[PDB]
Design a protein around this ligand. Sequence first.
Ligand code: RQD
Length: 330
Amino acid sequence: STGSATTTPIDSLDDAYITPVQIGTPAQTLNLDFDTGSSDLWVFSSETTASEVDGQTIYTPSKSTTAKLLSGATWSISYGDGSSSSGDVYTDTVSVGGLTVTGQAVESAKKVSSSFTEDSTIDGLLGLAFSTLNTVSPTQQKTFFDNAKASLDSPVFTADLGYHAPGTYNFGFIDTTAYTGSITYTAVSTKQGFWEWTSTGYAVGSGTFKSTSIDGIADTGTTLLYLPATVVSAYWAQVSGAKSSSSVGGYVFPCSATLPSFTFGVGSARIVIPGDYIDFGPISTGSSSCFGGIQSSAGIGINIFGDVALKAAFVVFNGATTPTLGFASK
Ligand SMILES: COC(=O)[C@H](N)Cc1ccc(F)cc1
């Protein structure tokens, strides 16, 4: 089996991407944020506190002939940005791009935090990290990918995120038309539950490549690229007037600037992030200070190759018995 679904940025900045997901029978289509940094498939639902729903599409298990309460199971999750949600659990049929899983744990929100409420375009999350991070208690549940893996033609999924444009998530096959050159594979540690890997270094603009090991995670549910403070300072030093603002919460730069590219290493290969990918626009409406797309990971405790990095590549999440990541230019 394979699946193929289009993923669409939620706004003009590529703050996140949403992918339609069919849940239940008859199908209820919700637009979920596919997140390679978490392991819960959770949705706004008929159970979500009414005051915490503002424009989302909800899953209503009572309208699904295939929904079953997973008796006694609860979930509660807290993300890196301080957002959170919690609730109870149903099993139901879930399809992505024509690939169907029966008996998938669908975590129904009773509570969502303000950031979720304030984002009308995201109906929930579909976690694609390792199932060891799934928060369901007392019986941990598997991700959609882990449940699909054994029906797939190949135990893989790929992320092909667009820059200010739609992209694709494929399951079970590698579209050799979707990238240029070859795919460079690199080792993964699953010890923390993430797609954790080690970049071989970086360059700023047309500068020399610095060979240095940068451990981090491939995380489609994080907008920006978070790297060590040394690396980030070296980048923003090439942008006249850029500075770290404690008031704004990161590096800002003059909106009149032209940003340099940023290159990261994957083994002996190189992925180039164009400068325009690093522009996240005015800090507030009408401001001439713009927010940077490369930020320090200091105090996060991990480096994060979020969408700014991943959208510059065709990314293979290889879920074979020994997982690996692959990156290709495109
Ligand atoms: C722990 O948070 C993360 O970094 C997730 N992988 C991405 C993520 C960030 C915010 C959010 F509301 C949902 C998901």
